[PDB]
Structure 1
Amino acid sequence: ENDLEAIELARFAVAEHNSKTNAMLEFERLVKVRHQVVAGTMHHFTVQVKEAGGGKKLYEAKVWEKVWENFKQLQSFQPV
């Protein structure tokens, strides 16, 4: 892309690599761009369950939901 904004982010990328690593690379050109729109909610649940033998345990769940799509997915399920 020759979109001026994409070039500006690419420069930002190089400049950030330079300040993170002290690399002194110079931006020459942007030879490829792919944009990935992300729009969702990450839900964080602490939840009480009834285990196999009747035991009451605590779990932390992470659900990722896309808001302009029909997509929910459990990311993580973890004891507390």
Structure 2
Amino acid sequence: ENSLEIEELARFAVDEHNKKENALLEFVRVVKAKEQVVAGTMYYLTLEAKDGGKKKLYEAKVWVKPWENFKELQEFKPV
């Protein structure tokens, strides 16, 4: 798991969650990441984000098709 790729995907998760749900979570870092080869790659991320300036953990599921510029936030939730 290339940590640079995962950092970008974690930021994309927080940004997409903010777009989708009209929120303002502030990305802090990735804690955990699992890649699972599928039709493309599926990522299960555990990350820190600040809610109201309060650090919290979230789980995100991110689907990537590396042959297109396709990245999709499948789910995002507190742990």
TM (norm. structure 2) is 0.49
Q: Which has the higher contact order (CA 8 A, sep 6+)?
A: 2
Superposition TM-score, scaled by structure 1 size: 0.48
**Largest Rg, 1 or 2:** 1
